[PDB]
RNA sequence: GUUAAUUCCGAUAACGAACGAGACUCUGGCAUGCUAACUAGUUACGCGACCCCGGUCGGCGUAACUUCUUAGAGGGACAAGUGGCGUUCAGCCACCCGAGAUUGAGCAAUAACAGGUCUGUGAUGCCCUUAGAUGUCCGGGGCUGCACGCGCGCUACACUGACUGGCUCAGCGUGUGCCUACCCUACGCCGGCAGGCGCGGGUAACCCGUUGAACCCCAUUCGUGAUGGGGAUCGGGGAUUGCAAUUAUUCCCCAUGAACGAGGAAUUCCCAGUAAGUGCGGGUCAUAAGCUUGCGUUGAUUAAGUCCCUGCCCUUUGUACACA
């Protein structure tokens, strides 16, 4: 089995986390890049780390990777969190109102409103799942 | 009981006590619509012809 | 002869394999026929690389057995060559075609095994292997303690197996295994 | 591995001490461990968005 | 789920870790590229010898170079590229390029055996003996004894073989000693042989040595007969080692010529340069390989799976066992 160990995988994740701009698709380029940036004592471990770097870069080019903190993907995530639309979906011209909700709003202070719409009650009381 | 040829279309798995028999789906090259499952001794790859002495027997699928 | 290949003095072509079940597993025609049945090796590395080995090389390899003869491949190349000479001087046909017909006739189509024994039809590569083993065993049994030499015995066993006259030990063991498998099914 | 001769018998002592790594090689060996991957920290660089020049000499 | 692996992916009252595995070292292969070479050579020349311009020479000497030689720094292989399977993660199979797409060993965790060693020790507790000695030295014998059974091995049962000639190829290696008295041997004569007599070389890429090893190849003799298979037993003689060979130390010659016709129940080892055949070195060695440890030649059958037997590792279950 050609299974990479944790000393390969965690070190490769640290290398890609610190030097995402330097690394690339080509194995013989980013192998020498990892040789320059990282102090690896042996060529076999260096080749394992470089191969797992190439595989994680293929995973990054395919999509997002869970156990990594890329600055560009973090900026994209922050942008998608800070995205604000134009008009709110809570502001509606017609709001569907059930009759018991209309009764409790009538017993509250806000009985009559401007933009509500009392609908007909759903006749036929069949809401539970059949057993077994 | 005539002799019929059958081509291997899908190997399923190892059967037998010592694991010496391949469970093999075979398509008959005479009637291509009919296909059966038999146990086969020997090294079996996909895409080769066995010479079945009878087509009526069938191995039990586990 | 740069285009067509000559197995010694024998032609590569005009070798008709009768059974289409044994077409890919008999490597004799147009790619695998060489000048000698000797070779370097590597055929036992992968599982189905043994099928790509030529059948005369497989007979050459299976002939050397029983302690005193392990690792005499030049010697059994000499045996197979003189046996092909005797096959031509008796039958008057292609020794390669006689050997292919001997494999087809001597290979048992079924066997029985423990799944009480139940009968199952064998793989064609296993059938080629069983035929190569049985005719070699019959030739060695005929050659042991006899004036008749190993080349004469191997030639007579291949000719009797291609004929199917039930005088060959390989044909007899093939009929015995087929009859036992016909019984216990 | 040493021996000590007590009155009742003889006791063996095994002392195994792993030496730490050093660049100089005085307190320990010079070669680092085969499992320790020493990864340096990247220097803080600022990417320029405006092309400029540094013509001198 | 995956892996040779508690190897990883992922879940998660766990987080952070540690040994082991892996990683590491040596070995094997690929680099017509770098460094190297009168203790390795290469190819060109100059001669010499022989055959009819050309061919051979490990016959001689020198001109650049390292392909063959050796050993140093590097490099190269990582599931990297492609096509599929797979939570599209961990990973798996096949294929292209390619010397390799699992070479082999060493090291090897916690805990334990009342496993072996007091006959390895001037490692040792306790007990025994200590002068008519269980200390030490010398002579002889024994450790080899033979109605019997077992184990590891060698020789074979032959014609796929034996004998007799001819051809033709290796790599591990080792080699003149503190005491230490004992090395590997070329070459020339004597003898059939074991061996003996003299000059030399070698502390070793210098000399043995281009290590002219066997199996194998070629050509006669044999003819299925316990035969020219097999060489046990035994008689007569001749040499080496040593103070001393008788219970034959070993080796050589002639002769004597047994069982054994492929082996019952039972059972061992193994899947690639592997098993097996086959020979060569080291250790024991004054004399010495049927053992062991390494190396080389020829070199396959079948398998790329399984828990059926023998066992091992996880989870669950039950226990009236815990020297289990
Ligand atoms: Mg014979
Ligand atoms: Mg004890
Ligand atoms: Mg004495
Ligand atoms: Mg003894
Ligand atoms: Mg016995
Ligand atoms: Mg004899
Ligand atoms: Mg005799
Ligand atoms: Mg011994
Ligand atoms: Mg119970």
Short mmCIF file of N, CA, C and O (backbone and C1' of nucleotides) in Angstrom, two decimals, chain E residues 240-282:
data_model
loop_
_atom_site.label_atom_id
_atom_site.label_comp_id
_atom_site.label_asym_id
_atom_site.label_seq_id
_atom_site.Cartn_x
_atom_site.Cartn_y
_atom_site.Cartn_z
P U E 240 55.84 -38.36 3.33
"O5'" U E 240 54.89 -37.16 3.77
"C5'" U E 240 54.61 -36.09 2.88
"C4'" U E 240 53.41 -35.30 3.34
"C3'" U E 240 53.40 -34.93 4.81
"O3'" U E 240 54.17 -33.77 5.07
"C1'" U E 240 51.29 -35.80 4.19
P U E 241 54.97 -33.61 6.45
"O5'" U E 241 53.84 -33.23 7.51
"C5'" U E 241 53.05 -32.06 7.35
"C4'" U E 241 51.89 -32.04 8.31
"C3'" U E 241 52.24 -32.38 9.75
"O3'" U E 241 52.80 -31.29 10.45
"C1'" U E 241 50.27 -33.53 9.09
P G E 242 54.31 -31.38 11.00
"O5'" G E 242 54.13 -31.87 12.50
"C5'" G E 242 53.24 -31.20 13.38
"C4'" G E 242 52.61 -32.15 14.36
"C3'" G E 242 53.57 -33.07 15.10
"O3'" G E 242 54.20 -32.44 16.20
"C1'" G E 242 51.73 -34.32 14.30
P C E 243 55.78 -32.65 16.45
"O5'" C E 243 55.90 -34.16 16.92
"C5'" C E 243 57.15 -34.71 17.31
"C4'" C E 243 56.97 -35.79 18.34
"C3'" C E 243 56.02 -36.92 17.97
"O3'" C E 243 56.63 -37.91 17.16
"C1'" C E 243 55.55 -36.17 20.17
P A E 244 55.80 -38.66 16.01
"O5'" A E 244 54.66 -39.44 16.80
"C5'" A E 244 54.95 -40.64 17.50
"C4'" A E 244 53.73 -41.14 18.23
"C3'" A E 244 52.49 -41.34 17.37
"O3'" A E 244 52.47 -42.60 16.71
"C1'" A E 244 51.93 -40.06 19.27
P A E 245 52.16 -42.69 15.14
"O5'" A E 245 50.57 -42.76 15.06
"C5'" A E 245 49.85 -43.60 15.95
"C4'" A E 245 48.47 -43.94 15.45
"C3'" A E 245 48.36 -44.49 14.02
"O3'" A E 245 47.40 -45.54 14.00
"C1'" A E 245 46.91 -42.67 14.28
P U E 246 47.48 -46.71 12.91
"O5'" U E 246 46.51 -47.84 13.48
"C5'" U E 246 47.02 -49.08 13.93
"C4'" U E 246 46.18 -49.68 15.04
"C3'" U E 246 44.73 -49.21 15.13
"O3'" U E 246 43.91 -50.31 15.50
"C1'" U E 246 45.83 -48.84 17.19
P U E 247 42.60 -50.67 14.64
"O5'" U E 247 41.47 -49.73 15.24
"C5'" U E 247 40.30 -49.43 14.49
"C4'" U E 247 39.35 -48.53 15.25
"C3'" U E 247 39.88 -47.13 15.57
"O3'" U E 247 38.83 -46.18 15.43
"C1'" U E 247 39.29 -48.25 17.58
P A E 248 39.03 -44.85 14.54
"O5'" A E 248 40.20 -45.22 13.52
"C5'" A E 248 39.94 -45.74 12.22
"C4'" A E 248 41.08 -46.61 11.76
"C3'" A E 248 42.18 -45.93 10.96
"O3'" A E 248 43.05 -45.15 11.76
"C1'" A E 248 41.67 -48.05 10.01
P U E 249 43.71 -43.81 11.18
"O5'" U E 249 42.49 -42.93 10.67
"C5'" U E 249 41.58 -42.35 11.59
"C4'" U E 249 41.66 -40.84 11.61
"C3'" U E 249 41.19 -40.11 10.36
"O3'" U E 249 39.78 -40.04 10.26
"C1'" U E 249 43.17 -39.11 11.21
P U E 250 39.07 -40.17 8.83
"O5'" U E 250 39.67 -38.94 8.00
"C5'" U E 250 39.57 -38.92 6.59
"C4'" U E 250 40.58 -37.99 5.97
"C3'" U E 250 40.99 -38.35 4.55
"O3'" U E 250 40.06 -37.89 3.59
"C1'" U E 250 42.92 -37.84 5.84
P C E 251 39.54 -38.88 2.44
"O5'" C E 251 40.68 -38.78 1.33
"C5'" C E 251 41.15 -37.52 0.89
"C4'" C E 251 42.50 -37.63 0.24
"C3'" C E 251 42.65 -38.77 -0.75
"O3'" C E 251 42.07 -38.49 -2.01
"C1'" C E 251 44.54 -38.70 0.66
P C E 252 41.33 -39.66 -2.82
"O5'" C E 252 42.52 -40.46 -3.52
"C5'" C E 252 43.47 -39.77 -4.32
"C4'" C E 252 44.65 -40.65 -4.66
"C3'" C E 252 44.32 -42.04 -5.18
"O3'" C E 252 43.95 -42.04 -6.54
"C1'" C E 252 46.05 -42.18 -3.57
P C E 253 42.92 -43.14 -7.10
"O5'" C E 253 43.80 -44.46 -7.21
"C5'" C E 253 44.93 -44.52 -8.07
"C4'" C E 253 45.60 -45.87 -8.00
"C3'" C E 253 44.68 -47.07 -8.07
"O3'" C E 253 44.23 -47.36 -9.38
"C1'" C E 253 46.27 -47.39 -6.35
P C E 254 42.76 -47.96 -9.59
"O5'" C E 254 42.94 -49.52 -9.30
"C5'" C E 254 43.92 -50.28 -9.99
"C4'" C E 254 44.17 -51.60 -9.32
"C3'" C E 254 42.95 -52.45 -9.03
"O3'" C E 254 42.45 -53.13 -10.17
"C1'" C E 254 44.35 -52.44 -7.14
P A E 255 40.86 -53.27 -10.37
"O5'" A E 255 40.41 -54.31 -9.24
"C5'" A E 255 40.84 -55.67 -9.28
"C4'" A E 255 40.65 -56.35 -7.94
"C3'" A E 255 39.22 -56.49 -7.44
"O3'" A E 255 38.55 -57.58 -8.03
"C1'" A E 255 40.60 -55.70 -5.69
P U E 256 36.95 -57.55 -8.23
"O5'" U E 256 36.37 -57.82 -6.77
"C5'" U E 256 36.65 -59.03 -6.08
"C4'" U E 256 36.13 -58.97 -4.67
"C3'" U E 256 34.65 -58.62 -4.54
"O3'" U E 256 33.81 -59.74 -4.73
"C1'" U E 256 35.92 -57.32 -3.01
P G E 257 32.83 -59.82 -6.00
"O5'" G E 257 31.74 -58.70 -5.72
"C5'" G E 257 30.97 -58.71 -4.52
"C4'" G E 257 30.25 -57.41 -4.30
"C3'" G E 257 29.12 -57.11 -5.29
"O3'" G E 257 28.03 -56.50 -4.62
"C1'" G E 257 30.69 -55.34 -5.31
P A E 258 26.52 -56.81 -5.10
"O5'" A E 258 25.66 -56.71 -3.76
"C5'" A E 258 25.58 -57.79 -2.85
"C4'" A E 258 25.08 -57.33 -1.51
"C3'" A E 258 23.83 -56.45 -1.56
"O3'" A E 258 22.63 -57.20 -1.61
"C1'" A E 258 25.48 -55.38 -0.26
P A E 259 21.62 -57.04 -2.85
"O5'" A E 259 20.46 -56.11 -2.28
"C5'" A E 259 19.77 -56.46 -1.08
"C4'" A E 259 19.56 -55.25 -0.21
"C3'" A E 259 18.62 -54.18 -0.75
"O3'" A E 259 17.26 -54.48 -0.48
"C1'" A E 259 20.60 -53.16 0.05
P C E 260 16.14 -54.31 -1.62
"O5'" C E 260 16.30 -52.81 -2.13
"C5'" C E 260 15.87 -51.70 -1.35
"C4'" C E 260 16.41 -50.41 -1.92
"C3'" C E 260 16.01 -50.12 -3.36
"O3'" C E 260 14.73 -49.53 -3.46
"C1'" C E 260 18.35 -49.81 -3.11
P G E 261 13.51 -50.33 -4.15
"O5'" G E 261 13.92 -50.40 -5.69
"C5'" G E 261 14.13 -49.21 -6.44
"C4'" G E 261 13.51 -49.29 -7.82
"C3'" G E 261 12.07 -49.81 -7.88
"O3'" G E 261 11.32 -49.03 -8.81
"C1'" G E 261 13.46 -51.08 -9.32
P A E 262 10.11 -48.11 -8.28
"O5'" A E 262 10.80 -47.12 -7.24
"C5'" A E 262 10.19 -46.81 -5.99
"C4'" A E 262 9.75 -45.37 -5.91
"C3'" A E 262 8.66 -44.97 -6.90
"O3'" A E 262 7.59 -44.17 -6.34
"C1'" A E 262 10.63 -43.67 -7.28
P G E 263 7.66 -43.21 -5.04
"O5'" G E 263 7.77 -44.16 -3.76
"C5'" G E 263 6.83 -45.19 -3.48
"C4'" G E 263 7.19 -45.84 -2.18
"C3'" G E 263 6.96 -44.97 -0.95
"O3'" G E 263 5.68 -45.15 -0.38
"C1'" G E 263 9.23 -45.64 -1.01
P G E 264 4.62 -43.95 -0.33
"O5'" G E 264 3.55 -44.43 0.74
"C5'" G E 264 2.63 -45.47 0.44
"C4'" G E 264 2.08 -46.10 1.70
"C3'" G E 264 1.71 -45.14 2.82
"O3'" G E 264 0.41 -44.58 2.64
"C1'" G E 264 2.97 -46.94 3.70
P A E 265 0.20 -42.99 2.62
"O5'" A E 265 -0.28 -42.65 4.09
"C5'" A E 265 -1.42 -43.28 4.66
"C4'" A E 265 -1.27 -43.47 6.14
"C3'" A E 265 -0.96 -42.21 6.94
"O3'" A E 265 -2.11 -41.43 7.23
"C1'" A E 265 0.55 -43.91 7.56
P A E 266 -2.15 -39.88 6.82
"O5'" A E 266 -0.85 -39.27 7.48
"C5'" A E 266 -0.83 -38.96 8.86
"C4'" A E 266 0.57 -38.71 9.33
"C3'" A E 266 1.19 -37.40 8.88
"O3'" A E 266 0.81 -36.30 9.69
"C1'" A E 266 2.69 -39.15 8.43
P U E 267 0.31 -34.93 9.02
"O5'" U E 267 1.66 -34.12 8.77
"C5'" U E 267 2.63 -34.00 9.79
"C4'" U E 267 4.02 -33.85 9.21
"C3'" U E 267 4.23 -32.66 8.30
"O3'" U E 267 4.45 -31.46 9.01
"C1'" U E 267 5.10 -34.59 7.26
P U E 268 4.18 -30.04 8.30
"O5'" U E 268 5.62 -29.58 7.82
"C5'" U E 268 6.76 -29.77 8.65
"C4'" U E 268 8.03 -29.57 7.87
"C3'" U E 268 8.09 -28.32 7.03
"O3'" U E 268 8.48 -27.19 7.79
"C1'" U E 268 8.86 -30.18 5.76
P C E 269 7.82 -25.75 7.53
"O5'" C E 269 8.51 -25.26 6.18
"C5'" C E 269 9.90 -24.99 6.14
"C4'" C E 269 10.39 -24.79 4.73
"C3'" C E 269 9.59 -23.82 3.88
"O3'" C E 269 9.90 -22.46 4.14
"C1'" C E 269 10.07 -25.77 2.63
P C E 270 8.78 -21.33 3.91
"O5'" C E 270 8.73 -21.14 2.33
"C5'" C E 270 9.86 -20.67 1.61
"C4'" C E 270 9.70 -20.87 0.12
"C3'" C E 270 8.52 -20.17 -0.52
"O3'" C E 270 8.79 -18.81 -0.79
"C1'" C E 270 8.65 -22.41 -1.30
P C E 271 7.63 -17.70 -0.68
"O5'" C E 271 7.36 -17.29 -2.19
"C5'" C E 271 8.41 -17.31 -3.14
"C4'" C E 271 7.92 -17.75 -4.49
"C3'" C E 271 7.19 -16.69 -5.31
"O3'" C E 271 8.06 -15.79 -5.96
"C1'" C E 271 5.99 -18.74 -5.38
P A E 272 8.00 -14.22 -5.64
"O5'" A E 272 9.15 -13.59 -6.55
"C5'" A E 272 10.52 -13.86 -6.29
"C4'" A E 272 11.38 -13.82 -7.54
"C3'" A E 272 11.04 -12.73 -8.56
"O3'" A E 272 12.25 -12.26 -9.15
"C1'" A E 272 10.92 -14.86 -9.59
P G E 273 13.09 -11.07 -8.46
"O5'" G E 273 14.51 -11.73 -8.19
"C5'" G E 273 15.30 -12.22 -9.27
"C4'" G E 273 15.34 -13.73 -9.29
"C3'" G E 273 16.63 -14.35 -8.74
"O3'" G E 273 16.32 -15.62 -8.16
"C1'" G E 273 16.36 -14.98 -10.99
P U E 274 17.25 -16.23 -7.00
"O5'" U E 274 16.22 -16.86 -5.97
"C5'" U E 274 15.18 -16.08 -5.40
"C4'" U E 274 13.96 -16.93 -5.13
"C3'" U E 274 14.22 -18.42 -5.05
"O3'" U E 274 14.68 -18.84 -3.78
"C1'" U E 274 12.39 -18.03 -6.49
P A E 275 15.73 -20.05 -3.65
"O5'" A E 275 14.85 -21.35 -3.90
"C5'" A E 275 13.82 -21.72 -2.99
"C4'" A E 275 13.04 -22.91 -3.50
"C3'" A E 275 13.86 -24.14 -3.82
"O3'" A E 275 14.13 -24.94 -2.69
"C1'" A E 275 12.42 -23.66 -5.63
P A E 276 15.59 -25.58 -2.47
"O5'" A E 276 15.82 -26.49 -3.76
"C5'" A E 276 15.15 -27.72 -3.92
"C4'" A E 276 15.30 -28.25 -5.33
"C3'" A E 276 16.73 -28.50 -5.79
"O3'" A E 276 17.23 -29.75 -5.35
"C1'" A E 276 15.58 -27.26 -7.43
P G E 277 18.77 -29.88 -4.91
"O5'" G E 277 19.55 -30.04 -6.29
"C5'" G E 277 19.23 -31.09 -7.19
"C4'" G E 277 19.87 -30.87 -8.54
"C3'" G E 277 21.36 -30.62 -8.54
"O3'" G E 277 22.13 -31.81 -8.43
"C1'" G E 277 20.31 -29.03 -9.93
P U E 278 23.35 -31.89 -7.39
"O5'" U E 278 24.42 -30.86 -7.96
"C5'" U E 278 25.01 -31.06 -9.24
"C4'" U E 278 25.70 -29.81 -9.72
"C3'" U E 278 26.78 -29.26 -8.82
"O3'" U E 278 28.00 -29.97 -8.93
"C1'" U E 278 25.41 -27.49 -9.56
P G E 279 28.60 -30.74 -7.65
"O5'" G E 279 29.69 -29.73 -7.07
"C5'" G E 279 30.96 -29.60 -7.70
"C4'" G E 279 31.25 -28.17 -8.09
"C3'" G E 279 31.97 -27.33 -7.05
"O3'" G E 279 33.36 -27.59 -6.99
"C1'" G E 279 30.18 -26.09 -7.96
P C E 280 34.13 -27.46 -5.59
"O5'" C E 280 34.45 -25.90 -5.46
"C5'" C E 280 35.14 -25.20 -6.49
"C4'" C E 280 35.12 -23.72 -6.23
"C3'" C E 280 35.62 -23.29 -4.86
"O3'" C E 280 37.03 -23.21 -4.79
"C1'" C E 280 33.57 -22.21 -5.32
P G E 281 37.77 -23.28 -3.36
"O5'" G E 281 37.72 -21.78 -2.83
"C5'" G E 281 38.00 -21.48 -1.47
"C4'" G E 281 37.45 -20.13 -1.07
"C3'" G E 281 37.31 -19.90 0.43
"O3'" G E 281 38.52 -19.49 1.03
"C1'" G E 281 35.30 -19.28 -0.65
P G E 282 39.07 -20.23 2.35
"O5'" G E 282 38.28 -19.54 3.54
"C5'" G E 282 38.44 -18.16 3.83
"C4'" G E 282 37.38 -17.67 4.78
"C3'" G E 282 37.32 -18.39 6.13
"O3'" G E 282 38.23 -17.84 7.06
"C1'" G E 282 35.13 -18.18 5.21
#
